Amino acid sequence: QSNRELVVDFLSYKLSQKGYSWSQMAAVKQALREAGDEFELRYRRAFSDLTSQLHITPGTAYQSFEQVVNELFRDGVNWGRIVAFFSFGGALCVESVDKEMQVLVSRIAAWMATYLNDHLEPWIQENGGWDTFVELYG
Amino acid sequence: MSQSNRELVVDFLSYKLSQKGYSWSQMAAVKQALREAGDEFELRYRRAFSDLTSQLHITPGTAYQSFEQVVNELFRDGVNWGRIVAFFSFGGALCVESVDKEMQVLVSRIAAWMATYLNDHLEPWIQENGGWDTFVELYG
Ligand SMILES: CN(C)CC[C@H](CSc1ccccc1)Nc1ccc(S(=O)(=O)NC(=O)c2ccc(N3CCN(Cc4cccc(-c5ccccc5)c4)CC3)cc2)cc1[N+](=O)[O-]
Ligand SMILES: CN(C)CC[C@H](CSc1ccccc1)Nc1ccc(S(=O)(=O)NC(=O)c2ccc(N3CCN(Cc4cccc(-c5ccccc5)c4)CC3)cc2)cc1[N+](=O)[O-]
Ligand SMILES: [Cl-]
């Protein structure tokens, strides 16, 4: 419940500041958050290109999110392209709130979970899983 | 495994929104305001915080009664948001000390002590002072 989630969240944070972690799941979350910030800093110019090639409206269809993201994996999966996929989704959500349509955020989140579980999870499983991501780029 | 992936999506998106001054949900907004409050506390009161972190010696045997005895001291004169933040900072420093000393099992014990102390001793004041929602208003 509420108080428990607050405790876990705060402790995960304080631990992460010293390079430690609350749980394997927290370690994955924190590593992904961190890889995203670093991706966005290292590829700032390119980040812009990817995010200005999709305007989200309440009209845009999933199949169209899918074909943009497909362009990103035009070279097949690696961990960095997966991080880029998360950053792309994140930038979509931010633009949606900028444009006063935070109601789109939950749809984008569903789209991301769909793409992840359909296309990407089978690769992730084959490549050591998220725990392996943490070992490499955590 | 897709529940995991879903959780990951939400976590990442909550993070990116928070960086632009937005929030995934109210609970996410409290989470961020409390993290940031703890950072600012530890910065503004670093000397008292630092001394406290050099004075930490816990063992796998330490009991919840002892922890409750220590934070009772923090709250002797009353509860306020500030001391609640200090309580969280305290817990975090305990966990970091436990891991420093390779006592991983103490980490989940401490979490439960904190939740127990919050639910039992702090929740009434929190509810009577406007809920975490009011914390976010004041210090978010
Ligand atoms: C701990 N710290 C100090 C170090 C962390 C370290 C660096 S921080 C980072 C994070 C993510 C990616 C890259 C770097 N971490 C890291 C390092 C390496 C890998 S990795 O080796 O696995 N990957 C890459 O190095 C890599 C992956 C993707 C990259 N971009 C950059 C450009 N962007 C443009 C783009 C947009 C749209 C379409 C196309 C397109 C269309 C059609 C055809 C082709 C392309 C192209 C596409 C994706 C660029 C590099 C993965 C990770 N990591 O996961 O953390
Ligand atoms: C948004 N931004 C830009 C500004 C946010 C602003 C400042 S940032 C902050 C955060 C927390 C506390 C104080 C300041 N925010 C804020 C401001 C005011 C309040 S307030 O008016 O309500 N309160 C206090 O001002 C206040 C409360 C308690 C204070 N001290 C300092 C003395 N110190 C002794 C100590 C130190 C360390 C550990 C223990 C300890 C721990 C466990 C066991 C035994 C001992 C004991 C603990 C208690 C000191 C000040 C609460 C909050 N706020 O919630 O954010
Ligand atoms: Cl103690």
Q: Which fold has domain A1-138?
A: Apoptosis Regulator Bcl-x (1.10.437)
Ligand 1 site residues, Cβ closer than 6 angstroms: A 35, 38-39, 42-43, 46, 49-50, 71-72, 74-75, 78-81, 83-84, 137
- Measured in degrees and rounded to the nearest 5, phi and psi for residue B117 equal -60, -40
Q: At what angle do helices A105-115 and A62-72 cross, to 10 degrees?
A: 50
CB A93 within 8 A of CB A108: yes
CB B29 within 8 A of CB B140: yes
User: Does residue B136 have its Cβ closer than 6 Å to ligand 2?
Assistant: no
**Residue B59: strand, helix, or coil:** coil
Overall resolution, Å: 2.0
- Ligand approaching nearest to the C-alpha of B97: 3
Length of chain A: 138
Q: Which long-range contacts (CB under 8 A, 24 or more apart) does B76-81 make?
A: B79/B122, B79/B125, B81/B37, B81/B129, B81/B135, B81/B138, B81/B139
**CA separation for the pair A64, B17 (Å, rounded):** 23
Enumerate the H helices of chain B as residue ranges.
Answer: 2-19, 26-44, 46-54, 64-74, 81-100, 104-117, 123-128, 131-139
**CA separation for the pair A2, A15 (Å, rounded):** 20
User: Does residue B37 have its Cβ closer than 6 Å to ligand 2?
Assistant: yes
CA distances for A104 relative to A60, A107, A132, B59, B69, angstroms = 10, 5, 32, 49, 48
Which superfamily does CATH assign the domain made up of B1-140 to? Blc2-like (1.10.437.10)
Chain B nearest-CA distance from A101, in A, is 12
